[PDB]
Write an enzyme that holds these catalytic residues in place. Structure first.
Site, PDB file in Angstrom:
ATOM      1  N   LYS A 102       0.816  -1.217   0.000  1.00  0.00           N
ATOM      2  CA  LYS A 102       0.000   0.000   0.000  1.00  0.00           C
ATOM      3  C   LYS A 102       0.847   1.262   0.000  1.00  0.00           C
ATOM      4  CE  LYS A 102      -4.405   0.773  -0.213  1.00  0.00           C
ATOM      5  NZ  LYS A 102      -5.201   0.146  -1.303  1.00  0.00           N
ATOM      6  N   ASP A 142      -5.930   3.989  -6.886  1.00  0.00           N
ATOM      7  CA  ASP A 142      -6.722   3.969  -5.664  1.00  0.00           C
ATOM      8  C   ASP A 142      -7.443   5.304  -5.521  1.00  0.00           C
ATOM      9  OD1 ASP A 142      -7.755   2.542  -3.578  1.00  0.00           O
ATOM     10  OD2 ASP A 142      -5.978   2.648  -2.308  1.00  0.00           O
ATOM     11  N   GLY A 216     -25.584   2.993  -3.543  1.00  0.00           N
ATOM     12  CA  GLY A 216     -24.406   3.586  -4.171  1.00  0.00           C
ATOM     13  C   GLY A 216     -24.481   3.292  -5.656  1.00  0.00           C
ATOM     14  N   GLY A 218     -22.177   4.533  -8.093  1.00  0.00           N
ATOM     15  CA  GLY A 218     -20.960   4.910  -8.776  1.00  0.00           C
ATOM     16  C   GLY A 218     -20.593   3.871  -9.812  1.00  0.00           C
ATOM     17  N   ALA A 220     -18.959   0.977  -9.313  1.00  0.00           N
ATOM     18  CA  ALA A 220     -19.227  -0.361  -8.796  1.00  0.00           C
ATOM     19  C   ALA A 220     -20.720  -0.653  -8.760  1.00  0.00           C
ATOM     20  CB  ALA A 220     -18.615  -0.515  -7.405  1.00  0.00           C
ATOM     21  N   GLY A 221     -21.510   0.257  -8.189  1.00  0.00           N
ATOM     22  CA  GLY A 221     -22.937   0.003  -8.062  1.00  0.00           C
ATOM     23  C   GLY A 221     -23.646  -0.084  -9.401  1.00  0.00           C
ATOM     24  N   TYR A 222     -23.371   0.871 -10.294  1.00  0.00           N
ATOM     25  CA  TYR A 222     -24.031   0.876 -11.595  1.00  0.00           C
ATOM     26  C   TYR A 222     -23.665  -0.365 -12.395  1.00  0.00           C
ATOM     27  CZ  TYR A 222     -23.793   1.590 -16.630  1.00  0.00           C
ATOM     28  OH  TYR A 222     -23.834   1.415 -17.993  1.00  0.00           O
TER      29      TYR A 222
END
Ligand SMILES: NC(=O)c1ccc[n+]([C@@H]2O[C@H](COP(=O)([O-])OP(=O)(O)OC[C@H]3O[C@@H](n4cnc5c(N)ncnc54)[C@H](OP(=O)(O)O)[C@@H]3O)[C@@H](O)[C@H]2O)c1
Ligand SMILES: N[C@@H](CCC(=O)O)C(=O)O
Length: 416
Positions: A102, A142, A216, A218, A220-222
């Site tokens: 990271k 990220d 959500g 965005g 990912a959700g869409y």
């Protein structure tokens, strides 16, 4: 509460359910290498400003470490260390030859121009060059970093590296023109859909015509809603952004909802649908629920009100342990957060493989390989779930920590 302490406590709770030596636990409680560097860039007004950059490599027993770079004004070494620790288990649960890594820079990228952003990326690469590489540490996009910054970073690394090896593979999430990979826009959603399909198979539920609700809207959700509707043949009945939500029992079209969002700025007042809020949206009687938004949405307050048969934690830890226990008591199957959204790191691994080999795959090949990896990981976690009679999150932790512990024992790092 500090994030690294939270991660260490999570690791200890995981070790409670498995047979792991004390020395191995002590080894896994510390990042194996932490690098804090100063990142100097010269601004547009001519002044030189110095930023703080991090690069934490938690563990590399299984292979080169992997993890993104955050550009957040509230970045801390504790946050980077906790996220690297989390990335170790994330890459271990889906069986990648990777460790945990990271990076981050304490910077507000909103106040930086494009030239300053490029200078920051190149200076960060120049600062952390000695600890990264195609076979040492592979950064990735990220929070507040995108493929453009990844391409700048790869170019700087290749310039320093004098083109003596696969400089494309030093970093993932690149543009398609320079070592980029197909399927990199729908990786997380596709992995979540594969895990949801496997969960329905395990529960004996046929998803053809069933209901899905997504929190959500965005990327990912869409994409989760869109892929669910097409591949799984489900009825999308509720979506929501940070603003508001809509509901329609007969089914919504995610493409039209995205168009409405683009036009009016939100999914509010969508035609043919009833405007609702996130909290009641979380409690519709739907076959599966996919929270893909701000973390910690399901708590003790609303855990018993969840009517979903499957909860796919597409977001990063959107469920609290108390809600975890309450949901498990109801028989509701949960997909752990770092197993559901493991498609992104899997596709980054595929991109790294393509860059290393010099040979690039098609969309179908990437999709099939992602299907295989996600199905195998989910079935491993579910088999541990049944055999140990523990929670799904605990089973995923058991699988990941067991893999890392086995790799550590094989190298001879820990003798017991
Ligand atoms: O990263 P990514 O690509 O997966 O996602 P993303 O595109 O970066 O955006 C995060 C998603 O979660 C939503 N969100 C942020 N805070 C929320 C909240 N408090 N409640 C409900 N939804 C929230 C965002 O909606 P908005 O776009 O409306 O902020 C967006 O849909
Ligand atoms: N999971 C992090 C970084 C891991 C990776 O993609 O390699 C992300 O959201 O990008």
């Amino acid at each position: 509460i500090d994030p690294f302490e939270m991660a260490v406590k999570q690791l200890e709770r995981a070790a409670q359910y498995m047979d792991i030596s004390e020395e191995a636990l002590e080894w896994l409680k510390k990042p194996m290498r932490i690098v804090e560097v100063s990142v100097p860039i010269e601004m547009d007004d001519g002044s030189v400003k110095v930023f703080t950059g991090f690069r934490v490599q938690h563990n590399w027993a299984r292979g080169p470490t992997k993890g993104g770079i955050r550009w957040h004004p509230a970045e801390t070494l504790s946050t980077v260390k906790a996220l690297a620790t989390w990335m170790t288990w994330k890459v271990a649960v889906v069986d990648l030859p990777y460790g945990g890594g990271k990076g981050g820079i304490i910077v507000n990228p909103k106040e930086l121009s494009e030239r300053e952003q490029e200078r920051l990326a190149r200076a960060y690469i120049r600062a952390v060059y000695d600890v990264i590489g195609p076979w040492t540490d592979i950064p990735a996009p990220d929070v507040y970093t995108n493929p453009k910054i990844m391409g700048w970073m790869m170019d700087e690394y290749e310039t320093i590296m004098r083109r003596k090896g696969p400089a494309f593979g030093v970093i993932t999430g690149k543009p398609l023109s320079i070592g980029g990979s197909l399927g990199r826009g729908t990786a997380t959603a596709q992995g979540a859909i594969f895990t949801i399909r496997e969960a329905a198979k395990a529960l004996g539920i046929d998803l053809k015509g069933k209901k899905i609700a997504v929190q959500g809207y965005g990327n990912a959700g869409y994409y989760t809603a869109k892929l669910a509707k097409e591949q799984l043949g489900m009825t999308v009945v509720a979506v929501s952004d940070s603003r508001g939500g809509i509901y329609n029992p007969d089914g919504l079209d995610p493409d039209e909802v995205l168009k409405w969002k683009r036009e009016h700025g939100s999914v509010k007042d969508f035609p043919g649908a009833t405007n609702i809020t996130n909290e009641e949206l979380l409690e519709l009687e739907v076959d599966v629920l996919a929270p893909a938004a701000i973390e910690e949405v399901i708590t003790e307050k609303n855990a018993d009100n969840i009517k979903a048969k499957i909860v796919a934690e597409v977001a990063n830890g959107p469920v609290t342990p108390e809600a975890d226990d309450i949901l498990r008591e109801k028989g509701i199957l949960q997909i752990p957060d770092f197993l559901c959204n493991a498609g992104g790191v899997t596709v980054s691994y595929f991109e790294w493989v393509q860059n290393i080999n010099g040979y690039y795959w098609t969309e179908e090949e990437v999709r099939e390989k992602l299907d295989k990896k996600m199905t195998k990981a989910f079935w491993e976690v579910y088999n541990t779930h049944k055999d140990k009679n523990i929670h799904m999150r605990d089973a995923a932790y058991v699988v990941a920590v067991s893999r890392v512990y086995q790799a550590m024992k094989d190298r001879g790092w820990v003798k017991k």
